[PDB]
Amino acid sequence: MRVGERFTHDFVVPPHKTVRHLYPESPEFAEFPEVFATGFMVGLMEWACVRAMAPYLEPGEGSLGTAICVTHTAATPPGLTVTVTAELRSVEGRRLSWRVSAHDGVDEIGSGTHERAVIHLEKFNAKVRQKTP
Amino acid sequence: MRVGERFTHDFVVPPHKTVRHLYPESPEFAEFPEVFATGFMVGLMEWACVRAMAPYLEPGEGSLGTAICVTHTAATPPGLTVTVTAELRSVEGRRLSWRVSAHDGVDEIGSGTHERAVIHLEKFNAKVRQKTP
Numbered sequence: 001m002r003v004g005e006r007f008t009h010d011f012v013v014p015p016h017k018t019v020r021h022l023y024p025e026s027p028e029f030a031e032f033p034e035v036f037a038t039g040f041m042v043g044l045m046e047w048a049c050v051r052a053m054a055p056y057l058e059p060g061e062g063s064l065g066t067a068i069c070v071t072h073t074a075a076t077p078p079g080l081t082v083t084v085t086a087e088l089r090s091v092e093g094r095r096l097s098w099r100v101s102a103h104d105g106v107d108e109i110g111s112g113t114h115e116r117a118v119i120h121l122e123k124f125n126a127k128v129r130q131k132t133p
Numbered sequence: 134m135r136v137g138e139r140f141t142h143d144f145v146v147p148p149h150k151t152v153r154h155l156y157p158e159s160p161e162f163a164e165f166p167e168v169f170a171t172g173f174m175v176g177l178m179e180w181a182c183v184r185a186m187a188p189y190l191e192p193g194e195g196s197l198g199t200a201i202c203v204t205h206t207a208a209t210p211p212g213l214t215v216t217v218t219a220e221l222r223s224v225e226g227r228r229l230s231w232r233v234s235a236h237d238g239v240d241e242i243g244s245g246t247h248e249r250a251v252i253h254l255e256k257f258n259a260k261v262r263q264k265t266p
Contacts, residue, residue: 034261039173043155047156065171079265124208128210
């Protein structure tokens with residue numbers, strides 16, 4: 001995988017990606033503005049990086065997000081398209097670091113870096129299984 | 134409120150907070166390990182700071198997250214209890230910074246900082262509706 005290689009992702013924001021929907025179990029969130037949730041924007045940014053890396057993975061390799069550091073600087077009601085751009089900034093063998101940005105066609109909405117680590121799935125899923133109650 | 138003040142809350146991770154559930158619509162996520170999603174960890178930390186903040190707002194006032202900078206270094210299967218601590222780091226006018234921290238009773242799972250901005254709800258909402266299609 002090459003440093004400086006870019007992927008963009010477009011996603012039209014539906015009603016069910018707002019703050020209320022990340023945690024429908026939260027009375028505290030239930031009267032928030034109907035805007036695209038930070039945790040969902042995080043998910044969309046991760047997803048772009050998962051897609052860009054996919055065809056570089058060996059069978060039975062997967063990957064996990066190990067860090068997210070971004071601003072969220074404008075709000076987006078449902079119906080606008082959020083475009084996420086991922087650019088790969090470094091690879092360490094196992095460890096990739098992406099610069100991610102997103103806009104919603106109207107404003108720049110957020111900026112930063114996401115990081116992930118390539119894993120061996122079977123033996124990752126063994127180790128998680130050993131802390132599963 | 135006071136700088137240094139900590140608020141804590143716990144959350145038994147249910148089966149529906151894993152990666153595949155953050156974006157049910159994503160075929161690329163659909164077969165990921167069954168572990169707690171970063172975007173749901175982000176949300177749960179925001180929720181800690183919303184709760185802490187809530188006694189100090191006037192009516193019609195809210196907050197929105199404007200930055201998150203966190204690592205996620207251990208994976209959490211459903212069943213475990215995720216304890217999240219938010220400690221107030223600063224207040225500058227309508228802006229607050231939190232130190233946020235999470236462990237699942239077994240591992241420390243993530244930490245870092247989170248910034249929020251206090252907003253006037255009626256005003257924000259009316260501006261938001263104006264970029265709505």
